Ligand binder design. Structure first.
Ligand SMILES: *[C@@H]1O[C@H](CO)[C@@H](O[C@@H]2O[C@H](CO)[C@@H](O[C@@H]3O[C@H](CO[C@H]4O[C@H](CO)[C@@H](O)[C@H](O)[C@@H]4O)[C@@H](O)[C@H](O[C@H]4O[C@H](CO)[C@@H](O)[C@H](O)[C@@H]4O)[C@@H]3O)[C@H](O)[C@H]2NC(C)=O)[C@H](O)[C@H]1NC(C)=O
Ligand SMILES: *[C@@H]1O[C@H](CO)[C@@H](O[C@@H]2O[C@H](CO)[C@@H](O[C@@H]3O[C@H](CO[C@H]4O[C@H](CO)[C@@H](O)[C@H](O)[C@@H]4O)[C@@H](O)[C@H](O[C@H]4O[C@H](CO)[C@@H](O)[C@H](O)[C@@H]4O)[C@@H]3O)[C@H](O)[C@H]2NC(C)=O)[C@H](O)[C@H]1NC(C)=O
Ligand SMILES: *[C@@H]1O[C@H](CO)[C@@H](O[C@@H]2O[C@H](CO)[C@@H](O[C@@H]3O[C@H](CO[C@H]4O[C@H](CO)[C@@H](O)[C@H](O)[C@@H]4O)[C@@H](O)[C@H](O[C@H]4O[C@H](CO)[C@@H](O)[C@H](O)[C@@H]4O)[C@@H]3O)[C@H](O)[C@H]2NC(C)=O)[C@H](O)[C@H]1NC(C)=O
Ligand SMILES: *[C@@H]1O[C@H](CO)[C@@H](O[C@@H]2O[C@H](CO)[C@@H](O)[C@H](O[C@@H]3O[C@H](CO)[C@@H](O)[C@H](O)[C@@H]3O)[C@H]2NC(C)=O)[C@H](O)[C@H]1NC(C)=O
Ligand SMILES: *[C@@H]1O[C@H](CO)[C@@H](O[C@@H]2O[C@H](CO)[C@@H](O[C@@H]3O[C@H](CO)[C@@H](O)[C@H](O)[C@@H]3O)[C@H](O)[C@H]2NC(C)=O)[C@H](O)[C@H]1NC(C)=O
Ligand SMILES: *[C@@H]1O[C@H](CO)[C@@H](O[C@@H]2O[C@H](CO)[C@@H](O[C@@H]3O[C@H](CO)[C@@H](O)[C@H](O)[C@@H]3O)[C@H](O)[C@H]2NC(C)=O)[C@H](O)[C@H]1NC(C)=O
Ligand SMILES: *[C@@H]1O[C@H](CO)[C@@H](O[C@@H]2O[C@H](CO)[C@@H](O[C@@H]3O[C@H](CO)[C@@H](O)[C@H](O)[C@@H]3O)[C@H](O)[C@H]2NC(C)=O)[C@H](O)[C@H]1NC(C)=O
Ligand SMILES: *[C@@H]1O[C@H](CO)[C@@H](O)[C@H](O)[C@H]1NC(C)=O
Ligand SMILES: *[C@@H]1O[C@H](CO)[C@@H](O)[C@H](O)[C@H]1NC(C)=O
Ligand SMILES: *[C@@H]1O[C@H](CO)[C@@H](O)[C@H](O)[C@H]1NC(C)=O
Ligand SMILES: *[C@H]1O[C@H](CO)[C@H](O)[C@H](O)[C@H]1NC(C)=O
Ligand SMILES: *[C@H]1O[C@H](CO)[C@H](O)[C@H](O)[C@H]1NC(C)=O
Ligand SMILES: *[C@H]1O[C@H](CO)[C@H](O)[C@H](O)[C@H]1NC(C)=O
Ligand SMILES: [Ca+2]
Ligand SMILES: [Ca+2]
Ligand SMILES: [Ca+2]
Ligand SMILES: [Ca+2]
Ligand SMILES: [Ca+2]
Ligand SMILES: [Ca+2]
Ligand SMILES: [Ca+2]
Ligand SMILES: [Ca+2]
Ligand SMILES: [Ca+2]
Ligand SMILES: [Ca+2]
Ligand SMILES: [Ca+2]
Ligand SMILES: [Ca+2]
Ligand SMILES: [Ca+2]
Ligand SMILES: [Ca+2]
Lengths: 70, 33, 212, 602, 71, 70, 71
C-alpha cells in the first residue's frame, strides 16, 4: 500500500517471502493458508480456490464432494 | 553382416576394412576387436 | 601549401605565375597527375599517388617531422614510443634493430629497460610488467623506502607495493591488481556538493547526472 | 559552407552548389581536360566514367553511348550484354546491376576447371595446384597439413609394387608420395590406407536423407515426398493437399493456404486463445480436430477446447462448434502438445509450475513433472522416439527431455539461453529439436540427446514459436506480427510470408505428414486408465490422487469414466450450407453441380 | 574543436584566425601586453610555444623536463 | 585554492579542500573568482580566507578560463 | 452495443456514407485568389503559400509562382 503519497515506498519492490502458514498466489501475493479452497476468491484471480479435491484440510472442517472445505 | 543400429545386411567383404560403412560401424569396432 | 587557392606568404611567391592547375581541395597534397592525397601520405614509404610522387627522392631526401616522432632510416616517421617494442612499425625494422635498441637513450623523464623499451618513469615499480623483461620491476629495489606512495594524494594497495592515485579508489575498475581499491566503498563519503551517489556506493561528478 | 560553391565537386546533395556558376576557362569549359564534365557543370574524375556508381547527380556519368567505349578488363570491369561495362565486384554480388541478370549468371561465375593440376603441379590435399616441387621436401609448403603424404625416404622404390593403396606420385628420393583419391582421408596409423568419408554426417547436405557409399554419397526423398529440383538445388516436395498455416489470435484462429495465399475464417468470437495443436483425421471422416488453450480472464479459469477442422475447402458454409474438455482450475495453459499415437494430450501451466497429461476427452488428469519448473512452456512429444521435451522460460532458463511416463528427466541445454519460448522437432533429420529465444532472439537446433548445438538463424527479431516442414522453418516475430521463413538448415536468406496482428501467438503448420500417421500404438489394452508411452514400449499409470491396487501394476483403485463423444460436425464441402433441424443434426444445403448427403458426389 | 586560435575586437568586429596549423592540442594561452607576444601550451607536443600577436614566427621555448633530476 | 610567494615559499590555503572541481581562477582587488566544473558554477569570495563565498551564475555547459577584464 | 472486434492496431473509425457530409454545399470562392481561397464565416479569404507574401497589398496576387494541378 502507498504510505508516502508519491508511492516511493512501493517502488523497486520485490515480493516478500511467504511465512510457514501462508500460501502464495500466482501473482506472488501471500494469504493465510486457511483461506485456500474456502469458496472465496481471496487471491483476486481465484489462484487460492483450485485443485481442491487433490488435497485434504484441517481436521475441524467438512470437505464437500467438489473438495472445498467448510 | 547385420550391424544392430540399422538392421541392414551389408556384404561381409566390408568387414574389417577400416571403413565405417554403417552408422555404428559394427563391421570395424564390433568384429575386428 | 604551395600552389593552391590562398596566398600564404607575405611576398606572394606562394602562388607564382607558373603555377599548375589546382585539382584538389585545401590542405591536401596534389599528385603530379592530378590525383589527391592527404599530407600524411608524404614520405611514409607506402606510395599513394598514381605516379608515386609522394615518395619521390627529391621530396623525401630531407624530410623532417615533429618532436613527438622518431624517423627511421627509411625516412618514415612514427611516434617516439613505437621504438623497440618487437613490432614492425617501420618497413625495414629500423625501429626494432638490435644495435639501435641496445645503444639508444630515452628522452628526458623516461626509464630505459634492458629490452630497449622506454617507458614513463611512473611505470617503474608498479607491479605491471611494462618492459616485458620485468626490468621495470626489480622486486628487491621496488619494495624499499624510496618508492613509498605520496600519502597526500596516493592510496597504497594492500597485498603488493603498488600505489594508485586516490581518485581511482572504488571507481569501478581494478587498479591495484588485487581489487584492494574497490573494497568497502560504502564507507567512502562523497564530497558534500560536487558528487552524486549512485545506486552502488560510487561517487561521480554531478555534471555527469542525466547526461545520456 | 560558402567556400564549397562553384568548385567542381557537388557538395550540395542536389548539386545546386555547382549547377549555376560562370564558365571556368576562356573557351566555356568548366573542367580541366583531365576530368569529365557532367552536363550539370559537375567536375568528375575521368576513370569514374560509367563504373556503375551514380557519380554525376545529374546522371551524365552513366550514358550508354559513353559506357560502351570505355576501356575495360575482365577481372576489374566486364561488358554486360546491355553494352554496359559492369564493375567486376558486382558479378554474382546477389543483385541484378544490369537489367538482364548477366551480372548474376553462373557461367561467368564459379570456375571453368578450377585450375587443375598437370604433371608439373602438386595436388597437395584436394586440388591446391602449386608446382610439383613441394613433393616430400619435408616442408609444409601447401599450408594445408597435407603437403607430405607418405614420404618415406629411399631411392629404390616405386609404390606400383603395392606399397600404397591408390594414386601415388613418384617421390624423387623416397619412392612414394601418396595423397588420397577424392572422397577419402588418410588414416592416422598406416597413412598409405585411405578411410572413406561419412558424407551423411555433415549438417544440411540434403533435404531429408543420405546413403554413405564408397568415396561417394546418394541422398533421396523418404516415403510421401517427391524429388524436385529448384534453381538452387534439391527439394523433397510433400504429396497430397498443400500445407496450411493456423494462426491463433486472442479472438480467432485463421487458416491460410501457403499455395493459394487466401485466408479462411475458422473459429471466431472466442477470447484469450494462447496456443493450439491438432490431431490429423482420427476417424477417417475427412476432418481433423484442433485443440487450443484459453487463458484465465479476470477472475475466471481458462479452458482447453477442441473443434473439428475441414481438411477440404470450406468457409462460411460450416459453422464451427467448439467443446470444452472440462479441465477445471486452468490458468496459463501456455504449452500444448497432442500425442497422436498414445491418444494423450500433454500441456504445461505457467501459474501451477507443472506438466499434466490427460486423454483427448479430458478424462484421468495426471501430473507428470511437478518440481524445479519455474515457467514451463512450449512442450512437444515424439512417440516414435518415446521422449517429450519442454522449455522453462523463468529466472534460470533450461530445455529438458523426459519419458512420457515421467521418468528419466534430464537437462538438454542450459548454456547461453534466454526465454526459450517455442519448441519443434524434425522427425526426418534424426529427431533433431529446434527452439526459439526472445532475449538473444536466435533460433537454434540440437540433437535429441543434447549434442551438436548449432545456431541455425541469427537476429530473428524475437521469434515466439516454430514449425518445421518440407525443408523450411517458419516463425513469428511477435512485436512486428509477421510470419517469417527460411531454409530449415540456416542457409540462404529470410523471407516474409504474411503479416497478421500483434495478437499473433503461434504459427502451426497443418498437413498429414507433420505427424507420421503410420506409427503403431504399443499399448495392448492391459492398462486401465492411462497407458503412457516410453522408449520402445508402454507404461500403465493411475489418475492423479489415486494409486495402483496393491500387488497389481495394471489396475488402480480409482473408478473409470465413459468417453466423451464429439457432437456431429458440419461436413459440407464446396460451399454447401450446413443446417440444423428439430433433431439439431448437421445436414447440408448442398450447392449446385454437386450431389450426395453432404456434397460428396460431383 | 576547430584547433585554431582566433582574435576579434571587443566591439565584436574584425574577427580573424591567426594560427591554424600544427596545433595538435592547445590547452591554455596568455597574451603579453608589453612585448606583444602570444604564449600557449600544447598538451600533445608537450611544449610551451611563443608567437607575435599576429600569429607569425612561432618558436618552441620549452620541452622535455624542468628539474635537474628530470622528475 | 592556495597561494604562495612567487618563489614558491610561504604557502597558505584559502579553501581547505572544500571545492568540488575548480578549473580556472582570477583575482581583482580583494576577490578571487573561479569556475567550477562539477557544479558548472562561477563563484567568488575573499582572496585570503574565502569568506563571503557567493555563486555568481550557473550554466548548462562547463565554464573555462575566466578573466577579469580591467 | 458491440459492433465487431479487431486487432489493437485499430486507430480510428470513420463512417463512409454520402449523407455523412452535405455534398450539395455551395463553394463560396469566386475564382479571385492566385493560390489558396480559404473559407470564413459567410465567405472566403485569399492566402499565399508559406513564406511568400502579397505583392503591394493586392490581397489576391502573391510573389509565389503558380504550380500545375496533380491528377
Ligand atoms: C589518377 O589520375 C590519373 C589521371 O591521369 C589516372 O592515370 C591515368 O589517366 C589516364 C588519363 O588519360 C588514363 O587513360 C590513359 O590515357 C592515355 C591517353 O590516351 C592516348 O591515346 C588516345 C587514343 O585515342 C588518344 O585519344 C589520347 O589523346 C592519348 O594519346 C593512354 O595512353 C593510356 O594508356 C596507356 O597508359 C596507361 C597508364 O597511364 C596504361 O595502363 C595503359 O596500358 C597504356 O600503356 C590510358 O588509356 C589511365 O588509364 C590512367 N591510369 C591507369 C593505370 O588507369 C589514374 O588512374 C588515377 N588514379 C588511379 C589509382 O586510378
Ligand atoms: C579549353 O581551355 C583549357 C585551358 O584553359 C584547355 O585545357 C588545356 O588543354 C591542353 C591541351 O590538351 C593541356 O595541355 C597539355 O597538358 C598535358 C598534361 O600536362 C598536365 O600536367 C603538366 C605538369 O603538371 C602541366 O604543366 C599541364 O598544364 C597539365 O596540367 C601535357 O602533357 C601536354 O604537353 C604534351 O604535349 C606536348 C606537345 O603538344 C609535348 O611537347 C609535351 O612534352 C607533352 O607530352 C600539354 O601541355 C592543358 O594542360 C589543359 N589545361 C587544363 C586546365 O585542362 C581545354 O582543352 C580547352 N577546351 C576546349 C574545348 O577548347
Ligand atoms: C490450398 O490451395 C490449393 C491450390 O489452390 C488447393 O489445391 C487444389 O484444390 C482443388 C479443389 O479440390 C483441386 O481441384 C481438383 O482438381 C482435380 C484434378 O487435379 C489434378 O489435375 C490438375 C490438372 O491441372 C492438377 O493441377 C492437379 O495437381 C491434379 O493432378 C479434379 O479432378 C477435381 O474435380 C474433378 O474431380 C472431382 C472428383 O471428386 C469431381 O467431383 C469434380 O466434379 C471434377 O470432375 C478438382 O477440380 C486442385 O487440383 C488442387 N490443386 C493443387 C495445386 O493442389 C488446396 O486444396 C487448398 N487447401 C486448402 C484446404 O485451402
Ligand atoms: C444541404 O445543403 C443544402 C445547400 O447546399 C441545403 O439546401 C438549402 O438549405 C437552405 C438552408 O436550410 C435552405 O434555405 C434552402 O431552401 C431554400 O432556400 C432559399 C434561399 O436560398 C429560399 O428562398 C427557399 O424558400 C428555400 O427555403 C435549401 N435549398 C437550396 C439548395 O438552397 C440542404 O438543406 C442541406 N441538406 C442536408 C441534408 O443537410
Ligand atoms: C512413418 O513411420 C513408419 C514407421 O513408424 C515408417 O515405415 C517404416 O519404414 C522403415 C524403412 O523403410 C521400415 O524398416 C524396414 O523394416 C524391414 C522389416 O519390416 C527391414 O527388413 C528393413 O531393413 C527396414 O528396417 C519399417 O518396416 C517401416 N514400418 C512399417 C510398418 O511400414 C515410414 O517410412 C515413416 N514415414 C516417414 C516419411 O517418416
Ligand atoms: C560587458 O558588460 C559590461 C556591462 O554591461 C559592458 O560595459 C559597458 O560598456 C559600454 C561601452 O563601453 C558602456 O557604454 C557607455 O556608457 C557611457 C555612459 O552612459 C556612454 O557615455 C557611452 O557612450 C557608452 O554608451 C557601458 O556604460 C558599460 N557598462 C558598465 C556597467 O560599465 C561591456 O561593454 C561588456 N563587454 C563586452 C565585451 O561586451
Ligand atoms: C635526484 O634526487 C635524489 C633524491 O632526492 C638525489 O639523491 C641524493 O643523493 C645524495 C648523494 O648520493 C644522497 O646523499 C647521500 O646520503 C647518505 C646518507 O643518507 C650518504 O651515506 C651518502 O654518502 C650521500 O651523502 C642523498 O641522500 C640523496 N637524496 C635524498 C634526499 O635522499 C639526487 O641528488 C638528485 N639528482 C641526482 C644528482 O641524481
Ligand atoms: C603523511 O601525511 C602527514 C599529514 O597527515 C604528513 O605530516 C607526513 O609527512 C606524510 N608522510 C608521508 C609518507 O609523506
Ligand atoms: C587418380 O585420380 C584421378 C582423378 O583426379 C582419377 O581419374 C584416376 O583414375 C585416379 N587413379 C587411380 C589409380 O585411381
Ligand atoms: C543556480 O541554480 C539555482 C537552482 O538550483 C537557482 O536558484 C540560482 O538562481 C542559480 N544561480 C544563479 C544566480 O544564476
Ligand atoms: C491433507 O491436506 C491437509 C492440508 O491442511 C494436510 O496436509 C493433511 O495432513 C493431509 N492429509 C493427507 C493424508 O494427505
Ligand atoms: C638519449 O639521451 C642522451 C643523453 O643521455 C642524448 O640526449 C640522446 O640524444 C637521447 N636520445 C633520444 C632518442 O632521446
Ligand atoms: C566563361 O568564363 C570564362 C572565364 O575566363 C570566360 O570569360 C568565358 O568567355 C565565359 N563564357 C563562355 C561562354 O565561355
Ligand atoms: Ca479463498
Ligand atoms: Ca567397413
Ligand atoms: Ca597557398
Ligand atoms: Ca606515401
Ligand atoms: Ca616498433
Ligand atoms: Ca611496471
Ligand atoms: Ca579502481
Ligand atoms: Ca551519466
Ligand atoms: Ca562545390
Ligand atoms: Ca558511375
Ligand atoms: Ca550482380
Ligand atoms: Ca612440401
Ligand atoms: Ca562415402
Ligand atoms: Ca601529453
Amino acid at each position: 500500500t502507498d504510505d508516502c503519497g508519491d508511492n516511493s515506498d512501493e517502488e523497486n519492490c520485490v515480493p516478500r517471502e511467504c511465512s510457514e502458514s501462508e500460501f502464495r498466489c500466482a501473482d506472488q501475493q501471500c494469504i493465510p493458508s486457511r483461506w485456500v479452497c474456502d469458496q472465496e476468491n481471496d487471491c483476486g484471480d481465484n489462484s487460492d480456490e483450485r485443485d481442491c479435491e487433490m488435497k485434504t484440510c484441517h481436521p475441524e472442517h467438512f470437505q464437500c464432494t467438489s473438495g472445498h472445505c467448510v | 553382416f547385420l550391424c544392430p543400429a540399422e538392421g541392414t545386411c551389408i556384404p561381409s567383404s566390408w568387414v574389417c576394412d577400416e571403413d565405417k560403412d554403417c552408422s555404428d560401424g559394427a563391421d570395424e569396432q564390433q568384429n575386428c576387436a | 601549401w604551395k600552389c593552391d587557392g590562398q596566398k600564404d606568404c607575405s611576398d606572394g611567391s606562394d602562388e607564382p605565375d607558373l603555377c599548375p592547375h589546382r585539382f584538389c581541395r585545401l590542405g591536401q597534397f596534389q599528385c603530379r597527375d592530378g590525383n589527391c592525397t592527404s599530407p600524411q601520405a608524404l614520405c611514409n614509404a607506402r606510395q599513394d599517388c598514381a605516379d608515386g610522387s609522394d615518395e619521390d627522392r627529391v621530396l623525401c631526401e630531407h624530410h623532417r617531422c615533429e618532436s613527438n616522432e622518431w624517423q627511421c632510416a627509411n625516412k618514415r616517421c612514427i611516434p617516439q614510443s613505437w621504438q623497440c617494442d618487437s613490432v614492425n612499425d617501420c618497413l625495414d625494422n629500423s625501429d626494432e634493430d638490435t644495435s639501435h635498441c641496445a645503444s639508444r637513450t630515452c628522452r628526458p623523464g623516461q626509464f630505459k629497460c634492458n629490452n630497449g623499451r622506454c617507458i614513463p618513469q611512473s611505470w617503474k615499480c608498479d607491479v605491471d610488467n611494462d618492459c616485458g623483461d620485468y626490468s621495470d620491476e626489480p622486486i628487491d629495489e621496488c619494495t624499499t623506502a624510496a618508492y613509498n606512495c605520496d600519502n597526500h594524494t596516493e592510496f597504497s594497495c594492500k597485498t603488493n607495493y603498488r600505489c594508485i592515485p586516490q581518485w581511482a579508489v572504488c571507481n569501478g575498475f581494478d587498479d591495484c591488481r588485487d581489487n584492494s581499491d574497490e573494497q568497502g566503498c560504502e564507507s567512502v563519503p562523497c564530497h558534500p556538493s560536487g558528487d552524486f551517489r549512485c545506486a552502488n556506493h560510487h561517487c561521480i561528478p554531478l555534471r555527469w547526472k542525466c547526461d545520456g | 559552407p560558402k567556400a564549397l560553391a562553384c568548385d567542381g565537386r557537388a557538395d550540395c546533395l542536389d548539386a545546386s552548389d555547382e549547377s549555376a556558376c560562370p564558365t571556368r576557362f576562356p573557351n566555356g569549359t568548366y573542367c580541366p581536360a583531365a576530368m569529365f564534365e557532367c552536363k550539370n557543370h559537375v567536375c568528375i574524375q575521368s576513370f569514374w566514367i560509367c563504373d556503375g556508381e551514380n557519380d554525376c547527380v545529374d546522371g551524365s556519368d552513366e550514358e550508354i553511348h559513353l559506357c560502351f567505349n570505355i576501356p575495360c578488363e575482365s577481372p576489374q570491369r566486364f561488358r554486360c550484354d546491355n553494352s554496359r561495362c559492369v564493375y567486376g565486384h558486382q558479378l554474382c554480388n546477389g543483385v541484378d546491376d544490369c537489367g538482364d541478370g548477366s551480372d548474376e549468371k553462373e557461367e561467368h561465375c564459379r570456375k571453368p576447371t578450377h585450375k587443375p593440376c598437370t604433371d608439373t603441379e602438386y595436388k597437395c590435399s584436394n586440388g591446391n595446384c602449386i608446382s610439383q616441387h613441394y613433393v616430400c621436401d619435408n616442408v609444409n609448403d601447401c599450408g594445408d597439413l597435407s603437403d607430405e603424404t607418405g614420404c618415406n625416404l629411399g631411392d629404390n622404390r616405386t609404390c606400383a609394387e603395392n606399397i600404397c593403396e591408390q594414386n601415388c606420385t613418384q617421390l624423387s628420393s623416397g619412392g612414394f608420395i601418396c595423397s588420397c583419391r577424392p572422397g577419402f582421408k588418410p588414416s592416422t596409423l598406416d597413412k598409405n590406407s585411405c578411410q572413406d568419408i561419412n558424407e551423411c554426417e555433415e549438417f544440411g547436405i540434403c533435404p531429408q536423407s543420405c546413403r554413405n557409399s564408397k568415396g561417394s554419397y546418394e541422398c533421396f526423398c523418404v516415403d510421401g515426398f517427391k524429388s524436385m529440383s529448384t534453381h538452387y538445388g534439391e527439394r523433397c516436395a510433400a504429396d497430397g493437399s498443400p500445407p496450411l498455416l493456423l494462426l491463433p489470435e486472442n479472438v480467432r484462429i485463421r487458416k491460410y493456404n501457403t499455395s493459394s495465399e487466401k485466408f479462411s475464417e475458422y473459429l471466431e468470437e472466442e477470447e484469450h486463445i494462447q496456443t493450439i495443436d491438432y490431431d490429423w483425421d482420427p476417424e477417417h471422416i475427412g476432418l481433423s480436430v484442433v485443440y487450443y488453450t484459453v487463458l484465465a480472464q479476470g477472475s475466471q479459469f481458462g479452458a482447453i477446447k477442441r473443434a473439428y477442422i475441414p481438411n477440404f475447402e470450406s468457409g462460411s458454409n460450416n459453422p464451427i462448434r467448439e467443446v470444452d474438455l472440462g479441465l477445471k482450475y486452468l490458468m496459463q495453459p501456455d504449452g500444448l502438445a497432442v500425442d497422436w499415437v498414445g491418444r494423450h494430450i500433454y500441456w504445461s501451466d505457467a501459474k501451477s509450475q507443472r506438466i499434466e497429461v490427460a486423454t483427448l476427452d479430458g478424462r484421468y488428469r495426471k501430473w507428470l513433472i511437478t518440481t524445479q519448473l519455474d515457467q514451463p512452456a512450449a512442450i512437444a512429444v515424439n512417440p516414435k522416439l518415446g521422449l517429450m521435451f519442454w522449455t522453462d522460460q523463468g529466472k534460470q532458463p533450461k530445455i529438458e527431455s523426459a519419458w512420457m511416463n515421467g521418468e528419466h528427466r534430464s537437462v538438454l541445454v542450459s548454456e547461453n539461453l534466454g526465454w526459450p519460448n517455442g519448441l519443434s522437432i524434425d522427425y526426418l533429420n534424426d529427431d533433431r529439436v529446434y527452439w526459439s529465444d526472445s532475449k538473444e532472439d536466435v533460433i537454434e537446433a540440437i540433437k535429441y540427446d543434447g549434442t551438436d548445438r548449432r545456431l541455425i538463424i541469427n537476429e530473428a527479431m524475437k521469434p515466439f514459436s516454430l514449425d518445421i516442414f518440407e525443408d523450411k522453418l517458419y516463425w513469428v516475430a511477435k512485436e512486428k506480427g509477421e510470419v517469417w521463413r527460411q531454409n530449415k538448415f540456416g542457409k540462404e536468406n529470410k523471407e516474409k510470408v504474411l503479416v497478421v496482428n500483434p495478437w499473433l501467438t503461434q504459427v502451426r503448420i497443418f498437413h498429414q505428414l507433420r505427424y507420421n500417421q503410420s506409427v503403431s500404438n504399443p499399448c495392448k489394452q492391459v492398462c486401465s486408465h492411462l497407458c503412457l508411452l516410453r522408449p520402445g514400449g508402454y507404461s500403465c499409470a493411475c489418475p492423479q490422487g489415486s494409486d495402483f491396487v496393491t500387488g497389481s501394476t495394471v489396475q488402480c483403485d480409482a473408478a473409470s469414466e465413459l468417453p466423451v463423444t464429439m457432437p456431429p460436425p458440419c461436413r459440407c464441402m464446396h460451399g454447401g450450407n450446413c443446417y440444423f433441424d428439430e433433431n439439431e443434426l448437421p445436414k447440408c444445403k448442398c450447392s449446385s453441380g454437386y450431389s450426395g448427403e453432404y456434397c460428396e458426389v460431383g | 574543436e576547430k584547433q585554431i586560435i582566433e582574435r576579434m575586437f571587443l566591439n565584436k568586429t574584425n574577427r580573424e584566425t591567426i594560427i591554424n596549423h600544427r596545433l595538435r592540442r592547445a590547452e591554455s594561452l596568455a597574451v603579453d601586453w608589453v612585448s606583444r607576444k602570444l604564449y600557449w601550451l600544447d598538451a600533445i607536443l608537450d611544449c610551451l610555444f611563443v608567437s607575435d600577436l599576429e600569429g607569425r614566427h612561432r618558436k618552441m621555448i620549452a620541452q622535455h623536463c624542468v628539474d635537474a633530476n628530470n622528475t | 585554492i592556495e597561494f604562495s610567494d612567487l618563489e614558491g615559499h610561504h604557502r597558505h590555503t584559502v579553501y581547505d579542500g572544500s571545492l568540488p572541481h575548480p578549473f580556472a581562477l582570477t583575482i581583482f582587488e580583494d576577490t578571487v573568482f573561479w569556475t567550477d566544473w562539477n557544479t558548472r558554477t562561477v563563484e567568488k569570495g575573499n582572496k585570503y580566507d574565502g569568506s563571503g563565498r557567493v555563486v555568481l551564475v550557473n550554466t548548462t555547459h562547463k565554464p573555462f578560463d575566466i578573466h577579469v577584464y580591467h
